[PDB]
Symmetry: D3
Subunit: 306 residues, 6 copies
């Protein structure tokens, strides 16, 4: 149980006991879905310390998400960054996942959010076993969802919002119920957008391709991989991608804070390339894990020591 | 405050004290938006009694919403109907708004959503006219939103789901920030769909028009008004409606449990007809209120005495 | 040259000599397309008199077109109805086409549209069969346009507006350039909408079909024919029509004030039915001309004597 | 009044008196919207002279607009360039605005433009005070319109045509009626296209972004700014932009002949960046005004001395 | 094998031995997909005889399919009807499936189809329940496909054309590969259109619902069922249907010549109603089989004895 | 006749006599459209020899097309490449058009392709310029089709599939029936996609434009021309292109195996630039024919000697 645990949660300005982090059922966000959250990793680094990965960019996006919804957050970025470090430190955590969430309180329950408190909470918990290059060598099997990805003037897709993930859950459940590892979603035009919670990449003829920044979230892992790709001399192309363009690709993979860099060996029971992790995916995977493990000089400023 | 009140809330099989109806901040629905709810009204009827309006139909829709999401609800329809009546009775309410809500608990916080408790809670409180008393009698000013209504293969629009209402909030806030009473949303094709929390009707040449049951919710108030219109010998036509078709209509109005029957006297600063409450609207509105107040011989079974 | 004529034109409150009806080249509507107009016919009736067909309905739509654009017209409906009768009378026309137009003057030439005079002019001239006397009896050859019909949230399709007809010109010119009589336009979804300046009907298995009132103008001739069809015991169905649904139709025809009721005997070089004017088209065509010629007692109220 | 002035207007081959530039009300373009126009600025340059900005490019676009409509213009580019200079010179103008317009005459008033004279007129009038960098230091407040931008197979959006601006007026009136400075329009897919009469740019992470050349007009100010940006070493990216991508941008601005380079400090009541003019926008403003004032070494060929 | 068997096939005017009905690999339709076919059943009637169900309507549609493609068929409807009867007779079949097919021959292999032979062949064989015999009585499990149903201005969906069924194969293969019985396809807007080879119906609150005749084939079984429904006093409604509208329907079923009337007990692992063949479905299914077996006098003219 | 010829056809593993390459009319692909094919040319090279142009890429794409449809091809790429060379050699062809085709056999004729034999055949014949020799030199006249290009989630557009060409035939017939040389198709959004059997390019201000790889085939000739353009120092830009963007372009041309590099001098009766073959088109066309004729050392590896 996530609720019944010893530990500390940061809530509305103070560290409180984990179990005391509670709200009433007539909370606006529970009923109407307007809330925003982040997903952030901390890694044990090669020198023995713990560092949060791209803390600044994640916290900037968190506040930008609230700003999209015109949610006045009673804390600045500097405060929230320190608070996230606090949560990791006081829970005696090393390799872990941080979940900041900002939501709308229980003062009034009309559609209008006007007059409700804007709450902020930050919790963290241990990550599972470290996978790395060795643990993420076998690709996963993906299914194209029959549910369509968010429309960009119905949902604000640059916001990492609570309400958006009903779509993700429906897509993810469709895939796993028929034995697949994850879903891949097409946008309203039938072009590949992203996974249920991950951005999508393919490789063809030594070049890295990814859907243009249209209906998908502006992933921080996505941005990380694109930067590492260019730095390694690999050309990156953003374009509209069809599903059969994926079927015929040399390699493919997912990126996300939780997913890191995860190879896709199969889509809709079409084997991707040779069916193993491809060489470009491997290269980017190693560049990625070198960065998050603090074995990279070029990107030291992406790690925040606890 | 909705949290800080005296009274009883029905939750997971029993009446608890109002303030005790709490959840952890790591509740699945708070983060990922998959929950379902209903809006139901109890009315003080002409005989001095209290009666819930179309309880069965609302409870049926609540379980169907959960069914669409494959959420297993640990209570059947008969139990939930009785629970709603219990809430109204034990809180000694003469008239109220009921809010049943079904959500996903705090046992685990992945998108993968497996193994979480399916919670159910029912609260009720006194709540006046959603769009105001002056609105009911004189009509309101409405603004066509620049936010687009839900796409039917992205959101499951037949389910009244928590996550869906980010879109309603964005639209409603856009309208009210510029001084309008409510928003009207167009679907992805540019046709009138509905209000942020209301089904939409217009009147033209003595006939009642409403958008076909496409991108909009299958409103129970909507269904009520259509039945009353047919019983009054008024022809009802379901079609695709353009915004300038509304600009030139004889009358227009909103329907919903909270909004009841609210006239629209103006859309996008274009006066609707004569600019007041039109004769067919007033006719349907009065017929509606005669039903909920228990003054009609034809629809007694739409009312459940407490 | 329709500028160089003898006669009277009603302009801004009074009858003036035809040639004096002039405007400056820095007229707002000339540059920015926002103006509204009507097409109205006066017929020689069987009693030797002249009557305008559905004057009230056309003048109502004209003012509603202005209302859609929030153009404040300096004259009421009674005044404009009389003025149109005045124009027919003072030009000694036994039968004619009336062109009322409302436009935005030359006081200021920004998009700001603020403070310009709202002008109104009415001219009239003899005008025979828009698509030919032969076309009326034998039917015409139509080409589906490669230009798409107006989107209903880009253009306000219920307004008969100046700026809309660029689309009609492009479609019409495409058809006639390759030797066809008229163009047929599909909407943004690829369903049949209407002709470049006519509503569309088809007949199949003794029933009359027409596109639903979606992206097409609410034609008065369209309404006229629908009514006459119902009165003739013919079932009328409004639906989304595909182009190959027309190819395989028993009959098809156009309606409009200029086009009256014009049979379509061929679409995209597919012969419609037998290839001439079909029986149900002929019955509806004859019912139509009986009405405008004042041989029909049931619809005398549709005719206004000069 | 634009009509009642002393001056000279070039019309159909020669300078005539301003007030004599008249046409009949039965002019085809007044009724049907197919006409094309340009907006061109002349600036007082640093050496005391007066020069038209990108006259050749504007006149090329004027003739291309007519060519798109298959309007045979009875004058070549060289003649029209000389006439525009003639109009500035003979009206004794310095800083001013030129308005060339090509339209369809009054020989026949069917939807068919066949047989009608193709007219050309050029007028010009003084500009208000020079704003420059200092005068355009305040960003404006923009509202996303509830009206959708032109469909590229319904309207020919590369043509600057009379009929297109009904949509612009509707969007602009919607914004200004609620107290905003200008409208921003989304295309039929919900992506930012442009302002009602201006192209749109945003800045993020030191890079310049703009909607790809899809549903928007190929603005000459847009082209000017893109070129200056590249010459200043600024990366220019063309992509599909969402409205919340604007909400979260560092800077944004409009470009247009009249608007020059105008910063945007707010969209839909979301503050853009810090709410002031950004450093990139200022740099591009400076480069732009250095060019139009004739103080640029690289782009003298963009100015035509009167 | 379908090729290797004893019997007779009608091909291009004459009955030939089954195995002799061959064509060259360089056959136009084989490479370019433009061919048309039909599915027709003969049943063993209750009097011992054999009758083809709705031969006239199927043969009319066959020629209309050809007409849509402008394929000149060298045989009239009378001849093809007789040919089909001969095929059933000369193969001594008491009950069977007829497959007429019209295709473009091997004279030329450019895209430009001109100058090729238009071939016609008619074969027949005994064929059981298309979706299984157990499915007819107990209902089948259906999966919403991730492939989108034909666009009505890309494909001519009223023609039963060879090339259209790549889409059907892709959807059907997707469903069967994961253990479902058949696929359900949504149109380009996300609404339920039809199965991969079946029209679709749902039942709710005593009424019969089916997608409007938009992107789906004008099914003859669909038409049969609608007629029988109306004759049974069951109200029939054509509308746009969402997938979650199916999830919450009382009943659902497929119709087609091969599939006859097939109940749907489950869609996307959501149980439909009580999870069995519903009462209305049962009533319409029995009405259907009574008609095709010649046990109903009302529709004798739908049967053609061999 | 394509059937009645002397020579050898490679079919299912061996060369057979041309006329013996036969299939049964009850072949799955003939009825349901799922098959894939290629177009490949052998050129008489400058040394008097004969070479297939980019045999590897075409054969790679052939198998990728099969892979998209999950068609298990009983031969590998090495075998198919050698077979194509065999067909040219044994037929004693100096230059020719090669047509490899993979289709689904005649074991079963249900929608389900499981489990029919996957057949492969390869024929070759002399074939001149697809769009004419004069067309290659002076450019052709093109008409924009009123038929819309394939939707990327209805058809798998990266597969060169038999079923896809009903659309091409319909577009191409529409163009030629009215005296044009070829059709140009817009995608479902109104943007230019490609010819009926050709990729599309335009030239503007020294730069080369082509629609992005979205709804069109990933043509190999397209790829070749892009590569040659970059080697010649010409910038290549991929973007969304409107039809009026073509109207106003400096040059335009088609590419394809059959069509080679064919200039377009006219679209929709708008002259493209000078009305003749433009300089950039001539340079690229010349560079192309240099490569396929074996006159260029840079791309010898694209040629496979028979």
């Amino acid at each position: 149980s996530m609720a019944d645990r010893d530990g500390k949660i940061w809530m509305d300005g103070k560290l409180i006991e984990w179990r005391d982090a509670k709200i009433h059922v007539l909370t606006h966000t529970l009923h109407y879905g307007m809330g925003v959250f982040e997903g952030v990793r901390a890694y044990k680094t090669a020198d023995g310390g713990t560092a949060i990965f791209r803390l600044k960019e994640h916290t900037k996006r968190l506040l930008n998400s609230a700003k999209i919804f015109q949610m006045d957050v009673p804390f600045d970025q500097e405060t929230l960054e320190a608070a996230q470090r606090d949560v990791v430190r006081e829970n005696k955590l090393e390799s872990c996942y941080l979940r900041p969430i900002i939501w709308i309180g229980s003062e009034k329950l009309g559609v209008s959010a006007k007059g409700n408190t804007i709450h902020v909470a930050i919790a963290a918990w241990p990550w599972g076993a470290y996978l790395g290059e060795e643990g993420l060598a076998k690709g996963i099997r993906v299914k194209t969802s029959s549910f369509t990805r968010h429309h960009v003037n119905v949902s604000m897709v640059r916001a990492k919002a609570s309400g958006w993930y009903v779509n993700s859950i429906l897509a993810n459940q469709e895939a796993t119920a028929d034995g697949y590892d994850e879903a891949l979603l097409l946008d309203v035009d039938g072009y590949v957008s992203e996974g249920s919670g991950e951005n999508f990449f393919l490789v063809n003829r030594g070049k890295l391709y990814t859907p243009d920044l249209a209906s998908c979230l502006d992933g921080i892992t996505r941005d990380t991989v694109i930067t590492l790709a260019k730095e390694a001399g690999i050309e990156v192309i953003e374009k509209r991608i069809t599903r059969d363009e994926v079927y015929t690709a040399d390699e493919a993979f997912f990126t996300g804070t939780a997913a890191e860099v995860t190879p896709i060996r199969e889509l809709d029971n079409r084997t991707i390339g040779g069916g193993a992790r491809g060489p470009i995916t491997e290269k980017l995977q190693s560049a990625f894990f070198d960065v998050v493990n603090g074995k990279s000089a070029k990107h030291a400023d992406w790690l925040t020591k606890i």
